[PDB]
Design a protein around this nucleic acid. Sequence first.
RNA 1: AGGAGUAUCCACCGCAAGA
RNA 2: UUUUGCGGA
RNA 3: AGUCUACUACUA
RNA 4: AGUAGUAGA
RNA 5: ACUACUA
Length: 1308
Amino acid sequence: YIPDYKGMEPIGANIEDLVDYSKDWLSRARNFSFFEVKGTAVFECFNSNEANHCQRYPMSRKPRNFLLIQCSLITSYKPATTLSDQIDSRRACSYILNLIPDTPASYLIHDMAYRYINLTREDMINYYAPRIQFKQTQNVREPGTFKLTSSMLRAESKAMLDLLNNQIESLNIASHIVQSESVSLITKILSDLELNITTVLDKFFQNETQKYLIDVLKKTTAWHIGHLIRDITESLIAHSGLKRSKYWSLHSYNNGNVILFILPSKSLEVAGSFIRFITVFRIGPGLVDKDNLDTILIDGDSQWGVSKVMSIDLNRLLALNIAFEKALIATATWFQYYTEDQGQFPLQYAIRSVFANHFLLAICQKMKLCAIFDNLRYLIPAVTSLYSGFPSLIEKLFERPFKSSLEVYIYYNIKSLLVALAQNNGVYPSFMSRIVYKHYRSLISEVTTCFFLFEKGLHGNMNEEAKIHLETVEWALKFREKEEKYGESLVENGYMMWELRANAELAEQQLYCQDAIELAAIELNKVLATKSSVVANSILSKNWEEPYFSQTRNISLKGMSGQVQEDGHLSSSVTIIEAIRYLSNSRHNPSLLKLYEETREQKAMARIVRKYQRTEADRGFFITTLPTRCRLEIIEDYYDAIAKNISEEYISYGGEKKILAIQGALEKALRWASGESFIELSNHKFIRMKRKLMYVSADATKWSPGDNSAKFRRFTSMLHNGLPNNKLKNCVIDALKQVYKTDFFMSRKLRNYIDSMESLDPHIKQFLDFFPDGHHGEVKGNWLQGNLNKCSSLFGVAMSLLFKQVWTNLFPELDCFFEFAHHSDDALFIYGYLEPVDDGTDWFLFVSQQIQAGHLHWFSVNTEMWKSMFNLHEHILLLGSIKISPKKTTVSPTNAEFLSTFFEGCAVSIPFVKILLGSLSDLPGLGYFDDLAAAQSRCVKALDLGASPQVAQLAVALCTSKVERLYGTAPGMVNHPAAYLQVKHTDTPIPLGGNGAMSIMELATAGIGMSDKNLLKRALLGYSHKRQKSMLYILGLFKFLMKLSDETFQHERLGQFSFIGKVQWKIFTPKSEFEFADMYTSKFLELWSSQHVTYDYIIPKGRDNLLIYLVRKLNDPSIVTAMTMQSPLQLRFRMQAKQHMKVCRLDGEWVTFREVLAAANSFAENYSATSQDMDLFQTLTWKDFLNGIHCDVIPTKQVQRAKVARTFTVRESIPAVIGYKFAVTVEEMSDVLDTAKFPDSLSVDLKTMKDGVYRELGLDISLPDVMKRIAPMLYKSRVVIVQGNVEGTAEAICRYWLKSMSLVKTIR
RNA sequence: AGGAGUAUCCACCGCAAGA
RNA sequence: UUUUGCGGA
RNA sequence: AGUCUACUACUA
RNA sequence: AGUAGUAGA
RNA sequence: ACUACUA
Ligand SMILES: [Mg+2]
């Protein structure tokens, strides 16, 4: 039953009125929103901003720090070993007890070194001892720490403690003294970092990346200093645990030259913590800025630079731990981009310099530098394009205090690069090296690489927790000023065309023209009414009568907001928690429409929370309560069903199929430009006009904040759908009316922050005055970011189509190709303008005749008519309250940017660096296989977006190395299988500490799971043809794995579970600490799950069962883990605990991975072939193409061309038929028919499961336990960036990858 | 002494004894 | 308010 | 630490 | 289907 | 929660 709500009634809008208004608008002269990019213009902007910047911030004489960890290296760095640490620590204490301290941060260092050196032999055993092999000492109370009482500190040493436990300024960048001294300092640091310290791919990578990047880089001090900072950060991470951070610690590296004195500090496990330490080092080539050193002690002409007490956040500490890995990935990406750009291998100097710059950026994890880089990814598109908002973007570049010599150096390099880029409008000077590029894609990829070298969240704890609110507040106030000025009815119901003509200031953001909105809906209807039947089928497909809280979105773990608490703030709860609350407080499971009926009068409460980004300004997103979610879900379902049917709307596309859609749009764009347009004169003369394209990489200034939800109300009421009634349309209009006003709550952090201030600044006072109650405030028309993405995107497409119709009406003589692609706010406008093919004596005469006849709008179309189209569009969109951004919107004849992917003509390029640098993120500590599979599969995505197979293989190697280093499993560590097993590392099953198929092409095409099967087959052949001991040992290892699994295939093919082998780690998952977890006793959940086995695969559609199902979900250990607010260190500690601690299940007891490996070795030594286990192996046994392929290296330089995106069908409802298999009850049957897309043929797809399993594994899935095991394997098309010549089939992509194994060489 | 900043923030919590 | 000793984050 | 759009792994 | 990771708006 | 042969 769809309710009867108010339906808005047509205004009778006529395109004639809008085309007449557009004629009047284009008749006059319009100031272009953008400025032409000229070298003189950019240089003058830089000079004027330099002159003005001296007054912005108080002058700074002393530059602040830029290096989080300072250290120097003169000899090759051997990475730390426990023996080397203790030898180097003793040597370093002997070194630095000779020096004479002067500063308190030198006396503390000397007094901690003297304490450490006075630790007994027993102290040195527990020191550097694993936690399981550690004892209390009364001087070494933790594995890597030692006590240091104040009783053991000099008078000045305790003064350093007093400073720690007891006014923004900018360097004068206008002066040449600072721009010389700061650049000279970094040029000395970078040059020191550049100093040299005294499968098919495995071969190709060895000759290409290793000989030309990882080897060239291997000798530099940047490489060894990166290893030294890995070991420093490993010590700091080891010191940041809850119990180890209370005490001090001394560690040393590079034969005692580098010493790390980790002071007591708050454990990084808890938030708002910093790992305070002092690093002392002999002054030499490296990350040293002697102006920012605490001391430089002298002894025998030797300089010992004592660094300041550097407090480092957990995010920054983990950044510095992967600083070498991030720098190496960035340099490999730059290396590949250089190879594609110039066709030549980068020179040694260029690679060393770019690695030094990348490593300095990875070390200097500063939000100031991160912000400047964030502005440079906007500045480079601005100063490269034809017209852009480069003056305003450069103004943004100077709205920052340059407080450190790196920011001054980075700014100076930015200024030089931007001025040089504006000279040409190919050639593209590099930001990190001297070599100039040829493709803008390489430069933009380079600067995005620099930007992504800064980890997300490098912002202030509360400085940027407040800044998210102000951006929302002002537009919630600008709306109020707009409402007061225009009457609160013009703003909400919308102004008419005659009002706009009378005022002409109404064409402003947050104000929408009613006639324009209706006409945009009409132009969208011109497409919709063609497929009205499909539109109606799509709308009624959505979950309108299907129950709420049965869709995964309404029961997910994503946070939502509850109600206003007694404190007055908005309660921060989980989506599932609110689902369970409403289900408990209701006697039935409501549908979407019924829940909207019951929850339409509540207000759309909301709360904003920071999405921890790397942007200069953190973009916090809103969290909506349950009624707001149901309103927005009604609107988004309606406008996703409607939007899926039109092609110029892109948020409705699927993932990377948006890239294919925009690629096809651009292909048709240059297809139209491939021609000469003809204008028909009264004499019938055909003026020939050269068709040209202008790509506007449009960005919307404050799309969600500063818009009007009300524009959609007249949109929905006029957007036609094939539905007979207007019942659903009226419901959607009502929902849009209910999302007009929002209760914007500021976070508890911000409220306590403001409530902990002695005085309130005037701008803070203005910000707080927005909320009338201390916490709540009113937001009008500003639909929260991302909540109406579908609806707003479709509205933008409609307004662009309306402008297209208006332009067609205005100039029917000119055939102009028009292609708009709105995703949500990012948009790409291709405007086809007919430039006069000659000097234009005819064209100018024709335009003059048109103007004289009465078409005054033709003044606009003579010179550069694309400007006229963009102006008219920027206006039409403004009539729909859409402001194309003056800055971050760039027009260009050739280059375009959409969805953070850069197009050049027919070519596309997505920067895969983000995937590669993001592949070094946290891991699931499930186990060694789960962690190795996650690490190795994160780079396959990059291989798809453009990554070179080597650069992806190198990333896989780095990820695998990190994962091993957290799990032993490294050669010469503790859990290395080769120590206890009798096979090589490559010939070891992944569960038993195996690297597996490290090759990316196997992981890209086959999968990680197939490495165990690929091993089994590789064993089976060895035990089927040669009958050697190695493959028999491998089979014994696999059989031991199955013995651990305790699953039984019994008679060949006729058993209980399907297995390949696994190991069971001691996963400690606590009990749920949430409100709706004790409602039903866990025993009741046990009986309920054992009876209703169908619901393990389909969400129940009845409130009575759904309550029990959701209570069970709250008690799921994985779900409990996902909602306990853990930290990335406790995760790292948990992975590392699987090195020495009793974390593995062997037999019936918990043993270490050492003992599991030993038991596996014993079993595989004693294993004997039963001729039935071989039958099991045959069943358990895309890789055919990979093992049967070969390539020939032609002596010719590899050619590079346009890159496109193509689909990839690697493998040929899946989770609901199993529910029908166990469907025993009437309610379960109803739920399984509701969940199934086509319930009629359920058994038809069940018989395929019976036949498919019997064909492959020969198992009787009719048994309950058997079917549950085959479900995970039953459940298991991507989109890749290839070259233009490559075909869109599965094998062609692999052929291209094989051809791309080399980088400067050719492969046939 | 750091991190963050033309938004006041983080940089350790409790206990018992002694000065 | 400093320290010492004991625990927790 | 949200909404969509996905991709990749891993788990019943 | 659930989690983890990543990317885009 | 570490310190291996560290891609
Ligand atoms: Mg854009």
